[PDB]
């Protein structure tokens, strides 16, 4: 697959995020427990709540599609469908809303992804959500200053940065320590205080942000200058227009 047109670093980064054969750069290590803490759906050590019986304990209808499509582990167990949601600053966050949703449905099975301007969300079976969330938090999907894990009160993608280069958070879930240069998550994604903070590492520097970002900007790489990307979008508009009139 070729994924996306364009000859900019932005375009290549968009292709890379979508391409399952591209190994996302892991930037930080987060423990299993801490992912569960950030998600806030259950306590560490608490059993997965269920929304229906295990598939094995039900009489599924005779169905060739059911026979051919392998359920994810959480579906087999009958897990709740839970979520993780991110906000990405328009000041050069590595991942951006549509890039996330496009990437998620290329990379992950059984995914419900939603794109908005100030937030992006994925909902899947809880135990599989935890495995996906680890990758979303550990890799270049996430920068602890320009990205935020936010289940509500998401305001910030379009706001100016604070003195530390941190994105605005109404609930200040992620705290930059001026003495140490590291960011800690002090609340879970819905905004409830954590027992013990989770280290999210150092913010990426300006040079690395520019290398990794998927947003076009006049002070980065401008979309209008990626003429091959623009051409395809204009081609789509024209072919859709003609198709609606006659086929």
């Amino acid at each position: 697959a070729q994924y996306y047109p364009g000859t900019t670093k932005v375009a290549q980064n968009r292709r890379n995020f979508c391409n399952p054969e591209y190994e996302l750069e892991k930037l930080r290590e987060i423990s299993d427990e801490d992912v569960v803490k950030i998600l806030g759906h259950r306590a560490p050590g608490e059993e997965y709540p269920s929304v229906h019986p295990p598939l094995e304990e039900m009489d599924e209808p005779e169905d060739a599609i059911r026979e051919m499509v392998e359920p994810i582990d959480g579906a087999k167990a009958g897990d709740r469908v839970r979520y993780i949601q991110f906000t990405d600053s328009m000041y050069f966050a590595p991942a951006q809303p549509y890039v996330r949703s496009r990437a998620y449905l290329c990379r992950y099975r059984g995914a419900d992804a939603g794109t908005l301007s100030g937030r992006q969300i994925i909902e899947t079976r809880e135990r599989d959500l935890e495995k996906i969330s680890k990758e979303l938090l550990e890799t270049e999907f996430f920068d602890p200053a320009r990205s935020g894990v936010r289940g509500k009160s998401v305001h910030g993608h379009s706001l100016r940065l604070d003195e530390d280069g941190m994105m605005f958070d109404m609930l200040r879930r992620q705290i930059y320590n001026k003495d140490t240069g590291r960011v800690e998550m002090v609340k879970n994604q819905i905004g409830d205080e954590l027992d013990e903070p989770v280290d999210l590492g150092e913010p990426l520097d300006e040079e690395t942000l520019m290398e990794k970002t998927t947003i076009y900007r006049v002070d980065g790489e401008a979309y209008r200058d990626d003429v091959e990307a623009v051409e395809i979008m204009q081609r789509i508009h024209v072919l859709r227009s003609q198709g609606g009139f006659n086929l």
Partner: protein
């Protein structure tokens, strides 16, 4: 010099508009705001009075961790907090809707033919004047025939009346000028010539029923109320039997055969009668706005006054209350009529078109769409990138998408002189915007924008329609903010550039060229500002019949 939005941005923030960083969290939350402080104090009093908790700043999340901005109402020097532009808090906005809801246009042409053909009586400019004096007594709710009738209090219904207009100058001259919408007085010469030619020797009534009735009841009341008092006044003035067979002819003419509703009725899922916002087509909304007849040398001003009219009505009142409610959609709409932002983008596009093609001189095709819409889209989006204050101001993607696409669509229509290629430009703008910033609007913002390109030039049953004829009930458009008012602007755009007197209906254009309306439709944004300052005096108040 500056971009037109610079003054507004300077008034909002301590920083220069170009600065990328700021300070949060230490502003005092809601305490930074005069308006939120008024609300907190009011909430305490309300709760105590009624014995039920109400407004409480400690419920949910704490507002005001960032600067709570003032907004400049575009083309004014009035700066207000956003709460003052909520329709519930703004009497000017409420009265604008009431003035449309309580209006119907009813011909006298069928009626006069019944009088002369069925009754065998004469109609003259003298009988018409007598009829008009009669109906202006009757229409607010007063009696003309029966004994022992009880009537509405004249002061409660002071805003209700009936006027007429006709394309025939001599006949208009013969009718008492108190009852006449003077087309030659209200419109510039060339526009007046066009409108009189459209109307011809036809004679039309503009009926406005009382605001207090419109508020107690609904929009579907208007044409019925109108018809009842036209009926009584026809009986009285022309000496029918008070209730003979011919009386039914007048009823059918006034209710069906020669009536123009402001809005048509809606399907069951959004069930509403006539004269509700969803039934008002974009062409009508453009013609209700009277900017065309006072700002005709500035097509951008005309188009953007229509955008303001529609953004407020369609997003704040219609989608934000009739179709949902609560806190609602104030800022989804204010994006289109504050801080001179859409003005800057659209003046840029106008100048681009003016320099490259000349207005209405571009080929009406896809080549022009690709050129103008792309150029204007890139300009708009570059302003958000160059000015961090602008991006923080219009913080929601939906709000930026609407503003950028509105400028792009209006500018394309400035070039082609055709609203349909203007619409195609609106959709192209959305596609480019989405790819540039890897976002667009809210979860369901671009339902219509993804269907958009294919449905612009479609001819199929529930797809194909000139933009002027589309409205809030066009299927793709029936749900979402940040489109409807902007479409009204795009409808206006080619006609403003062409110098056309109207967009879709000349009777509607003339019907609101009336100095006796409560809301001033020649200066919509000025009126919104006046309402924000709590200086607008609406009709329909019950102060006269309630305790001191």
């Amino acid at each position: 010099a500056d971009k037109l939005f610079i003054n507004a941005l300077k008034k909002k923030f301590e920083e220069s508009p170009e600065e990328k960083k700021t300070t949060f969290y230490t502003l005092g939350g809601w305490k930074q705001s005069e308006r939120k402080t008024e609300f907190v104090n009011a909430g305490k009093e309300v709760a105590a009075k009624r014995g039920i908790p109400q407004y409480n700043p400690d419920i949910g999340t704490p507002l005001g961790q960032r600067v709570l901005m003032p907004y400049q109402v575009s083309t004014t020097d009035t700066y207000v907090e956003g709460d003052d532009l909520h329709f519930v808090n703004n009497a000017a906005m409420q009265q604008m809707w009431d003035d449309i809801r309580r209006t119907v246009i009813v011909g006298l042409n069928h009626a006069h033919a019944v009088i002369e053909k069925r009754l065998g009586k004469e109609v003259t400019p003298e009988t018409i004047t007598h009829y008009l004096e009669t109906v202006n007594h009757a229409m607010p709710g007063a009696a003309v025939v029966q004994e022992h009738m009880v009537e509405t209090h004249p002061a409660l219904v002071a805003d209700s009346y009936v006027k007429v207009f006709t394309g025939n100058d001599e006949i208009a001259d013969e009718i008492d000028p108190a009852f006449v919408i003077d087309i030659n007085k209200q419109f510039p010469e060339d526009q007046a010539e066009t409108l009189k030619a459209e109307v011809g020797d036809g004679i039309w009534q503009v009926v406005r029923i009382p605001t207090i009735v419109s508020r107690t009841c609904d929009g579907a009341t208007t044409s019925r109320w109108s018809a009842m008092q036209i009926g009584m006044s026809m009986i009285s003035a022309y000496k029918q039997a008070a209730g003979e067979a011919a009386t039914g002819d007048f009823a059918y003419a006034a209710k069906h055969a020669e009536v123009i509703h402001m809005g048509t009725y809606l399907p069951v899922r959004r069930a509403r009668g006539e004269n509700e916002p969803g039934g008002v087509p974009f062409g009508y909304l453009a013609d209700i706005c009277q900017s065309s007849r006072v700002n005709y040398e500035d097509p951008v001003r005309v188009s953007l006054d229509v955008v303001a009219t529609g953004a407020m009505l369609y997003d704040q009142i219609w989608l934000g209350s009739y179709m949902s409610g609560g806190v609602g959609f104030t800022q989804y709409a204010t994006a289109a009529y504050t801080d001179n932002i859409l003005d800057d983008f659209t003046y840029f596009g106008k100048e681009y078109v003016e320099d490259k093609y000349g207005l209405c001189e571009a080929p009406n095709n896809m080549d022009t769409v690709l050129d103008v819409a792309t150029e204007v889209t890139f300009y708009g989006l570059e302003q958000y990138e160059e000015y961090p204050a602008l991006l923080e101001d219009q913080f929601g993607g939906s709000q930026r998408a609407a503003v950028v696409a509105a400028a792009a669509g209006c500018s394309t229509a400035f070039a082609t002189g055709n609203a349909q290629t203007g619409l195609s430009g609106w959709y192209l703008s959305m596609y480019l915007h989405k790819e540039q910033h890897s976002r667009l609007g809210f979860y369901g913002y671009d339902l219509q924008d993804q269907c958009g390109a294919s449905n612009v030039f479609s001819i199929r049953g529930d797809e194909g329609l000139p933009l002027e004829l589309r409205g809030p009930n066009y299927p793709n458009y029936a749900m979402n903010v940040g489109h409807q008012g902007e479409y009204a602007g795009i409808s206006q755009a080619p006609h403003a550039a062409r110098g056309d007197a109207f967009v879709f209906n000349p009777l509607v254009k003339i019907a609101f060229a009336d100095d006796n309306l409560v809301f001033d439709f020649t200066n919509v944004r000025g009126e919104f500002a006046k309402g924000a300052l709590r200086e607008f005096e609406p009709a329909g108040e019950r102060a006269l019949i309630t305790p001191a």
